[PDB]
């Protein structure tokens, strides 16, 4: 009863992409198929269903004619063919399962969408890839009330999306945290993790923030100390 | 083939809440509508098919009604784990699946928190990397209405920033960013920025100057 | 038709009513079910009965 | 294309013969059949036993 996909990834404006799905628990002739894309923040839109038993498929009018669908009942799975793709399909994608298939259009008034899958994130652009910029933001008394302070590691000027900082290779979970990534005009991604700690211990213990690009090979450990 | 509804929604937790969609004539008119919830990052669930049936695991509490050409979900009773999007379907004669626009939910609960503000000016490294960069963290202000303005020592600034949207913590409060860019050569040249946060007509404001 | 249980869904029995409605000449036949709304009194009022 | 029928049931004091005097008649009936109608007859019940 369970729904995967997986095809994802980067490709410039102007590429392909083959995404797919694979299901388990049911037959796959008892139910008809819809992919969804989903912009990140905004609302859901649908994209096409392909009914149970063989073929009768629609899309929706903005990606008419640009993509393909089909289904395999012989491997359980779905495939979806992008062609010439534009710089506003980035999206999530998800695989759901239309129960009662038949196309909406002729088993009316009972189609819903009961299960649904993990989704797949696909995004497009020529920045290409890049690697961060790291610096240090360091703790200060502008940042320090009391007891406490809070010093951090900002990691700029990045596409490829996942990217990791973390706080002594994994060792202080008190206030460390990472705020959301951030999408510059640039076209290139940024972000800052601060954390604090007793106002006693600005300079006296161990903090090195370990910044991992992994779709790139990009691994730097930087210290952030009181300022000068 | 528009689907209007409402964007949000509010209510006290324990009563009832009715949320509303109105299609025309091939949404609504001759087809069935279906409720999806979204819970913030999961997958979405299926609340309501056929106007008013909900599937094995939905709870008595989800109602539907479909009037005409208008549909409605009503839930009877909110509680702290129905804060969510929520979105109506229909077929549309058209030969397309439209949907919702969704709405949210507002329990409002949690009494009013303060943002906690920080400022950050561009570190040494990025002066010497012919940049610079100021960084204004927001923090812990449960309704999250934020908005920030940016401050050049006397004026506003309104080029060069970027925003984060509020997003939810662990402690179900929210937290914002943004960020300044800034040659250094305009970083010298004024003598002083800040970053100012509003908040419910509230307002707090942070500052630094340039050593 | 060979109608077994453990078929799928595209060899099972669908049962199937179509209506069609005429309006040739006829005095009155089937209508639908008009409303009422309440009586008041002792008002000038715009009535129908 | 309706058929209407008005009756009236009075007690004679007689047997079988038309008596005299005034009595109005009032509806029972309405039909919307259509049926056209140009003849008509009448139903008895024999004598056996
Ligand atoms: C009754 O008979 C007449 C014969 O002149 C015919 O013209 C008429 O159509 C008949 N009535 C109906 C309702 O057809």
């Known amino acids: 009863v369970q729904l995967v996909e997986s095809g994802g990834g980067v490709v410039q404006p102007g590429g392909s992409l083959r995404l797919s799905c694979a299901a388990s628990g049911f037959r796959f002739d008892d139910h008809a198929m819809h992919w969804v894309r989903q912009a990140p923040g905004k609302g859901l839109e649908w994209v096409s269903v392909?009914?149970?038993?063989?073929?009768?498929?629609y899309y929706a009018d903005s990606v008419k004619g640009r993509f393909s669908i089909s289904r395999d009942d012989s491997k359980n799975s779905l495939y979806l063919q992008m062609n010439s793709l534009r710089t506003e399909d980035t999206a999530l994608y998800y695989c759901?399962?239309?129960?009662?298939?038949?196309?909406?259009?002729?088993?009316?008034?009972?189609?819903?969408?009961?299960?649904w899958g993990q989704g797949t994130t696909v995004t497009v652009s020529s920045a290409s890839t890049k690697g961060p910029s790291v610096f240090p933001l360091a703790p200060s008394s502008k940042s320090t009330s009391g007891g406490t302070a809070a010093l951090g590691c900002l990691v700029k000027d990045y596409f490829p999306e996942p990217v990791t900082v973390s706080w002594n290779s994994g060792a202080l979970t008190s206030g460390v945290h990472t705020f959301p990534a951030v999408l510059q005009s640039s076209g290139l991604y940024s972000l800052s993790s601060v954390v604090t700690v007793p106002s006693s211990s600005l300079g006296t213990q161990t903090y090195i923030c370990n910044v991992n690009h992994k779709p790139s090979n990009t691994k730097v450990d930087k210290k952030v100390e009181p300022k000068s | 083939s528009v689907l209007t509804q409402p964007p949000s929604a509010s209510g006290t937790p324990g009563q009832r809440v009715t949320i509303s969609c109105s299609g025309s004539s091939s949404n609504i008119g001759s087809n069935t509508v279906n409720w999806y919830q979204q819970l913030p990052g999961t997958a979405p669930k299926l609340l309501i098919y056929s106007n008013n049936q909900r599937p094995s695991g939905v709870p008595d509490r989800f109602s539907g009604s479909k009037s005409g050409t208008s549909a409605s979900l009503a839930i009877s009773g909110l509680q702290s784990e129905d804060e969510a999007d929520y979105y109506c379907?229909?077929?549309?004669?058209?030969?397309?699946?439209?949907f919702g626009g969704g709405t949210k939910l507002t329990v409002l609960g949690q009494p009013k928190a303060a943002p906690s503000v920080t400022l950050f000016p561009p570190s040494s490294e990025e002066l010497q990397a012919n940049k610079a960069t100021l960084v204004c963290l927001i923090s812990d202000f449960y309704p999250g209405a934020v908005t920030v303005a940016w401050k050049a020592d006397s004026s506003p600034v309104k080029a060069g920033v970027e925003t984060t949207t509020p997003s939810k913590q662990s402690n179900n409060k929210y937290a914002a960013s943004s960020y300044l860019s800034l040659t250094p050569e305009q970083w010298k040249s004024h003598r002083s920025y800040s970053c100012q946060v509003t908040h419910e007509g509230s307002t707090v404001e942070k500052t630094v100057a340039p050593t | 038709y060979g109608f077994q249980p453990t078929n799928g869904v595209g060899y099972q029995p669908y049962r199937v009513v179509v209506l069609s409605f005429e309006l040739l000449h006829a005095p009155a036949t089937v209508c639908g079910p008009k409303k009422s709304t309440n009586l008041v009194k002792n008002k000038c009022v715009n009535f129908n009965f | 294309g309706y058929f209407k029928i008005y009756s009236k049931h009075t007690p004679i004091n007689l047997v079988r013969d038309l008596p005299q005097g005034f009595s109005a008649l009032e509806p029972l009936v309405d039909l919307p059949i259509g049926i056209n109608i140009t003849r008509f007859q009448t139903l008895l019940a024999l004598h056996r036993s």
């Open positions: 392909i009914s149970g038993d063989g073929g009768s498929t």
């Open positions: 379907a229909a077929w549309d004669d058209s030969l397309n699946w439209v």
């Open positions: 759901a399962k239309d129960r009662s298939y038949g196309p909406p259009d002729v088993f009316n008034y009972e189609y819903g969408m009961d299960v």
